[PDB]
Amino acid sequence: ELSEAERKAVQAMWARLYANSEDVGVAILVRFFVNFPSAKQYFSQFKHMEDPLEMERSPQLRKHASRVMGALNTVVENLHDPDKVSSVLALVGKAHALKHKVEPVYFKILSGVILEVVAEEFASDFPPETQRAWAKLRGLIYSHVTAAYKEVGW
Ligand code: HEM
């Protein structure tokens, strides 16, 4: 789990992100789909879309952006309550394993894009203590999502 200082570091960072949650979520996903075109295969309204301006304006992209940011928000705000973070990430993990059939490695890829976007957009607020805290959060997400895939015999 995150230590108290790490949790505080992650929540303070996340608050800055979430002040324009909508735009940050979308910028993250556009970068994800441009840089990893294979990930678009799970999205019916944009699986063959290439123009990043259209991706930015895509209703189904912006919707998934809103749901990624909201589920992340739930995890970050409730990091002091580890049963809640377990709860949320299971539900996500399973859902993506079973309904959406997404290869679990795409979570690792998306997290790397999330890191790249955070490092760019909020660099002057991203000291090493915070970078390390954020990296623990990423590990936490990937291990919990990865355990949920194993749980239903992926
Ligand atoms: C931090 C990681 C992610 C979070 C928190 C997240 C969150 C969500 C949530 C809350 C939903 C709506 C409920 C549901 O139908 O499951 C959703 C839908 C979906 N997600 Fe994710 N997601 C993540 C990563 C991914 C990745 C990497 C992919 C595939 C590359 C993906 C593919 C989908 C698809 C195909 C849907 C259905 C969208 C639709 O109904 O049009 N997600 N996501």
Question: In this structure, what DSSP letter does residue 126 have?
Answer: -
DSSP percent split of the chain into helix, strand, coil, nearest 5: 80, 0, 20
Tokens of 123: 């660099």
Q: Which domains occur in the chain, in start order?
A: 1-154 (1.10.490.10)
Q: Residues 55-62: contacts with CB within 8 Å, 24+ apart?
A: 55/29, 55/30, 56/26, 56/30, 61/26, 61/29, 61/30, 61/33, 62/22, 62/25, 62/26
Pure H helices in 37-127: 52-56, 59-77, 82-98, 105-121
Alpha carbon nearest to ligand 1 atom 5, residue: 68
**92 CA distance to ligand 1 centroid (A)?**
8
Angle at 75 between CA 29 and CA 107, to 5 degrees: 40
**Is 107 touching ligand 1 by the criterion CB < 6 Å?**
yes
Tokens of 73: 């928000």
- Residue pair 118/134 in contact (Cβ under 8 Å)? The answer is yes
CA distance 150 to 154: 6
Report the interhelical angle of 59-77 vs 82-98 (nearest 10°): 150
